[PDB]
Amino acid sequence: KFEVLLGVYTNAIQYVRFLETALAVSCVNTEFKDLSRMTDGKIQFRISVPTIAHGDGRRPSKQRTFIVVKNCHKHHISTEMELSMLDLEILHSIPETPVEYAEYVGAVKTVASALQFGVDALERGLINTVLSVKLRHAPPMFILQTLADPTFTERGFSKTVKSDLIAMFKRHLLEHSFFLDRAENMGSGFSQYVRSRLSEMVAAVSGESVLKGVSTYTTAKGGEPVGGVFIVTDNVLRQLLTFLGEEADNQIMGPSSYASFVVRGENLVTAVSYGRVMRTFEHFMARIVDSPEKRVPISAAVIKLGNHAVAVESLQKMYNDTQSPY
């Protein structure tokens, strides 16, 4: 009269990568790194803004250059991985019998699932801190519906234009908050309303920016540059592929920017990929023996908003591995 063991199963850990997810369209991963070595976190920009030469003799149309200093955000991420010393004791011991060899391989797998816990901790920690930067520099859309439009500003911030900009904030907070709620209450204005709100977001954001370069993060189907990325939750992701219906690319971005981290970012997880944990511990056991004798596709949907092909991506799946708040 036996008891059966029908099987014991375990889940694979999905190796996220910041240069694999679509949130790295918003952040360039450069090869300078002097500013972390630099004490002062500022950097001084010599920008040059054009101006219209006046035709009348109101005032001389002088040149304009701004010297703007931009202070960097130096963040520190730190987890912990408690690892028990009675596994360390069989790490240091050399095994000779298959019971202790099985215990040694089990403790090596325990350590190889601690360093991999560290890599999968800081990789989600990196993307979490990136997301927490982009929630620290994002005033909401009901401000940039007006303040990013030069029809109110650039005549001089007087008492009056601020006194009307506050009251116009009060209108877009009412008639235009919770925009995906009104699209459900509206009938055949399903598709073009949400296209209107998304393209107004793109027009309110994409403006003058210093420190430009080549067209980074091209897609695969058309080859155009990706203008921006839309981080959303899963419910709005499942909705906004139906209000839009069709996507420009087949969820593939083709960025050749990921070339200087295929050598630099892969050999950091390959050294803890259990081929190298066992190899380094075999080398340490050989030293103990020596002692007494003496480019790529990116999974990201591309929608089209007029001319700019932004991307949409939901990281809810990544935050749900942790069972933490989004």
Binding site: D40, K42, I43, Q44, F45
Partner: peptide, 23 residues
């Protein structure tokens, strides 16, 4: 300071062929 936001490439050493001090 005026070195609050600038990189620096090199220095100018005043005729000191084996010294790292001075102006």
């Amino acid at each position: 300071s005026a070195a609050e936001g600038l990189f620096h490439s090199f220095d100018l050493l005043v005729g000191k062929d084996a010294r790292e001090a001075g102006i």
